[PDB]
Write a protein that binds this ligand. Structure first.
Ligand SMILES: [Zn+2]
Ligand SMILES: [Zn+2]
Length: 399
């Protein structure tokens, strides 16, 4: 399993979206400022009709009794929910939310779908934590309080504590202002003081969503994946057992830790780290540390239902089909690491590594099962290695 659990993330994607601004016959009712989703004053019995079934549809209304009292009513399958609705210079239901409508319903619905399914899980996140050994709070080189602050993450982010997904559209969790940490609102309570405010000058590259890293650094492909390969190709392209042999684990850590600031885009060479299996390791590491797999989860399933054709003519075309359903960042990263990788195949006369060969060492890391249905999951691990091998083989045909 990966340090970064995917249950929540997995959920949010399943979560229902504001299935209806469900506007009125343009009645333009007078008492009302912001909205066209406002059906003025009406009865619960009449409102419900407007929504009806459509889990996710929402509407706004005023109290037939007490004036100036508006309330939001969105459907959540099981039934219909009325929430109230204020405006502190910006729309907002309960929670110290404060948004800009829809964002509300959206996030609200998310908070609903998740909390409903496995709220128990969301509670035990505190138990058996993981913050202890995650990074730089273990490596790198007394008491102090955390000046935590609510923060809206732009890009999937995970709690450096319960190492779980921070769901929500803008809710998110908190990011200490001094040490740069980022965790769940709750978890903030359970996270020990410690904190090293100069450990913020870091800016981790290893471990944040692929697409996000790329977009933020302006580069299509993770600058690590780039540099790494550069070297591996410069040096040991003909070293034996490339990517199969492991390097000093504790030396790979040193590399990663190097990409994370300390050099970031300006890391390091051939000497300093002579056993290239380190680098080959670090690179493997990088793919291992992604919160979302290069092959994604939403694709994992479909990528398997391809390595099952047996008729190599359709396999390839199948693979391509789904290879296309991949998010830009992922795709591009895969593409690249399926050359300055598959060029390794053009060398098994010196490194003993080939498609089928590498397809092993990578399958397991460039792919991951959604989980929570573990049974045939083991009867699939095979195909993973296949897929990879296949991609390395027919490299210049797919991209
Ligand atoms: Zn957490
Ligand atoms: Zn701090």
């Amino acid at each position: 399993p990966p340090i970064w659990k995917s249950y929540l993330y997995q959920l949010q994607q399943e979560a229902p979206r504001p299935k209806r601004i469900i506007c009125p016959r343009e009645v333009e009712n007078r008492p009302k400022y912001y909205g066209r989703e406002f059906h003025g004053i009406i009865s619960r019995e009449q409102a419900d009709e407007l929504l009806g079934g459509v889990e996710g549809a929402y509407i706004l209304r005023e109290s037939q009794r007490q004036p100036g009292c508006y309330t939001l009513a969105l459907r959540f399958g099981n039934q219909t929910l009325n929430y109230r609705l204020f405006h502190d210079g910006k729309h907002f239901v309960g929670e110290k939310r404060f948004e800009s409508i829809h964002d509300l319903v959206t996030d609200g619905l998310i908070t609903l779908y998740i909390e409903t399914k496995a709220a128990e899980y969301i509670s035990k996140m505190t138990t058996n934590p993981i913050y202890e050994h995650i990074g730089y709070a273990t490596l790198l080189r007394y008491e102090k309080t955390h000046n935590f602050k609510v923060h809206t993450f732009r890009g999937p982010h995970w709690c450096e504590y319960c190492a779980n997904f921070m769901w929500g559209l803008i809710a998110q969790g908190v990011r200490c202002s001094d040490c740069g940490l980022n965790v769940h609102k709750q978890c903030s309570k359970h996270v020990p003081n410690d904190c090293q405010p100069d450990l913020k000058r870091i800016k981790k590259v290893y471990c944040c969503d692929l697409t996000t890293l790329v977009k933020a650094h302006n580069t299509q492909r993770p600058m690590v994946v780039d540099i790494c390969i550069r070297e591996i190709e410069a040096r040991g392209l003909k070293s034996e057992g490339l990517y199969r042999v492991s390097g000093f684990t504790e030396h790979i850590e040193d590399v990663k830790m190097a990409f994370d600031r300390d050099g970031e885009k300006a890391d390091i060479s051939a000497n300093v780290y002579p056993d290239i299996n380190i680098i080959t390791g670090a690179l493997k590491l990088y793919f291992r540390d992604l919160p979302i797999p290069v092959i994604t989860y939403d694709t994992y399933s479909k990528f398997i239902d391809a390595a099952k054709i047996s008729n190599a003519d359709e396999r390839l075309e199948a693979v391509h089909e789904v290879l296309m359903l991949l998010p830009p960042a992922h795709y591009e990263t895969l593409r690249y690491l399926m050359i300055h990788l598959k060029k390794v195949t053009m060398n098994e006369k010196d490194n003993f590594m080939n498609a089928e060969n590498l397809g092993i060492v990578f399958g397991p890391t460039l792919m991951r099962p959604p989980e929570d249905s573990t049974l045939t999951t083991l009867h699939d691990m095979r195909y993973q290695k296949l897929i990879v091998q296949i991609l390395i083989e027919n490299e210049d045909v797919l991209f």
